[PDB]
Curated annotation (Swiss-Prot), chains B, C:
It comes from Thermococcus gammatolerans (strain DSM 15229 / JCM 11827 / EJ3). Signal peptide: none annotated. The keyword DNA-binding applies. This is DNA polymerase sliding clamp. The keyword Electron transport does not apply. NCBIfam families: pcna (TIGR00590), PRK01115.1-2 (NF002219), PRK01115.1-4 (NF002221).
Length: 248, 247, 247
């Protein structure tokens, strides 16, 4: 565990990224190499897989001597990261000691000391899955549909056809459909190999999109009775990815 | 029995229904060729509400045959709360027995709302001998009710020739809200005789919860008489509360 | 008739009373012709609090009868939270035992807040040998108190000739806020010798709750001495907390 210094401009954007990921997980092992920071984790129900990739190109300073792996209490990390202001600089620094030093530089110099726990890593791989449908769309639409489907049901059907993406949720007698064509604003891109249907639990969906903003582009990939893969991009270089198991 | 009604400004429409459903729970909407109307009482039969929306405030108004539909107001409120200020609202009914609510904006979002049948009542609004008419900004009204709640649970209205007063007194505390024509918040006053009545704050509070700050509100009342309070939606639709006085 | 005081900007006045009520329950106001003054302790007898409002901050200040009134701060605060930022606040004491509070804006609103008899103790705001003085933005100050609240119950303050340093430590975790004259949030630093003290966060939490981020706070303290926190009210008035230290 050699020392490193990592620096990020915009402490608030970082917090909101960490907060999204932390919605599902509680402890995570961050891999720090000379190429970037990568975190890969499942939530306790072993239904969501989170994968964070922050290449070194999104950091204003990235001094990493030797590749190591630190364990972080995600909720404690978030309580601290939430004190960052939008124009603050975030500095994550480790010395010889077994804690993390999180510093905010702006109107003052605020320094926290975050104790480094140990996390047991699972053999977690991001496999190449045969997704038959791909969908880029505004977070605004996505956040909307999960909130609207929550009014009716616990699960949300996704239905992708050559020219229309559709979410649908059926309750005791109440029903909601959201429908999107390339003629719509919310829909940026739609690639369907074959007509594709699948369903996913709103509870998990609500937590994955909770930290996404109305303005962001989200990519969806999914297949008939296959995982849902949702990802968006951080400073157009970092990537946050969720893999979500279906309802069967 | 199909129809199609289109309203530009989904969020405005919600604010309207949300004002109505503060006191109502279930309503029959009368859909005719001239507009949509609804007349409901609250559970304690203290308040009559009367919503009229002429065809001229809808962008598209296609009604084949006049009809009446009953709506669970609370469910309808929940769905209407999902519209954005720039969405277009579409109220469509096919030959089936539910209500298609649709928001066209960044996406097409469609809800099916089951209809219900509603105990309708000998609901008529006779003209009553009001001796006082006040017109005032909504924020003056919302203020004086929120202020009065701190002291009492009744609000006394008192009109003389050139002063309008709301007064609320408790055991030791007391608040008074005086309005004269010189004040920006009063837009009009007409009093034929000195008028005094009192009304409950619980009901009043709920009547104005959904009223904008800069809305023009009209109050008509009379000594130991009901309080008629109305204000306009888009200058052509009208919302009326009739409120029973206190002893 | 015994006095009439007028203050343009009711919400500004409210926010000031609201600051000094986070610690105080009852208080005696000394109304002289020079201005209004107020000096109270919190129930712990740990924070001394002292408010002074020179008559030059009031648009109208007529005092016939210099006297002293007693006020239930929570009741006063409930009323004062009803003034709008464009309201004119009026305080009238007539012959009787109540304080008439008026908001003049879009309407005339009047409250009668009943006065009370407060066991006014003898409170001297003494002079103390402070060795460190710091001026800084509320934003910094409120953050440090929130930050430090995630770790500990006390907050060390540490002034050296060049840097000001708040520091809170628990069993495992640590926060540390450091300010030099090169930082935008420090505006004045005057240190006579190296100074260190400690204070309860819970009390610091309430003293700053009502302070705006744009505000300018003056800290004076010395080793194991009270903490003196000033912030000014329209440049003429002064609010002053005095905070017994933690050992």
């Amino acid at each position: 565990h050699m020392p490193f210094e990592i620096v990020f401009d915009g402490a608030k954007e970082f917090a909101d990224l960490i907060a999204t990921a932390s919605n599902l997980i509680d402890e995570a092992a961050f891999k720090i190499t000379e190429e970037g920071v990568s975190m890969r984790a499942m939530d306790p129900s072993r239904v969501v897989l989170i994968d964070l990739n922050l290449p070194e190109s999104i950091f204003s300073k990235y001094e990493v001597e030797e590749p190591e792996t630190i364990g972080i209490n995600m909720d404690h990390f978030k309580k601290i990261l939430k004190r960052g202001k939008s124009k603050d600089t975030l500095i994550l620094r480790k010395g010889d000691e077994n804690f993390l030093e999180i510093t905010f530089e702006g109107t003052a110099k605020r320094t926290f000391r975050l104790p480094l726990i140990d996390v047991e890593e699972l053999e977690l791989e991001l496999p190449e899955l045969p997704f038959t449908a791909k969908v880029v769309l505004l977070g605004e639409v996505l956040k909307e549909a999960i909130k609207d489907a929550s009014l009716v049901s616990d699960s949300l059907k996704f239905i992708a056809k050559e020219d229309e993406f559709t979410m649908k949720a059926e309750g005791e007698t109440n029903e909601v459909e959201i429908k999107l064509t390339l003629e719509d604003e919310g829909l940026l891109d739609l690639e369907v190999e074959e007509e594709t249907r699948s369903a996913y639990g709103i509870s998990y969906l609500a937590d994955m999109v909770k930290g996404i903003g109305k303005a962001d582009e989200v990519t969806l990939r999914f297949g008939t009775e296959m995982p849902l893969q949702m990802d968006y991009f951080i400073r157009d270089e970092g990537k946050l990815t969720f893999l979500l198991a279906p309802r069967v």
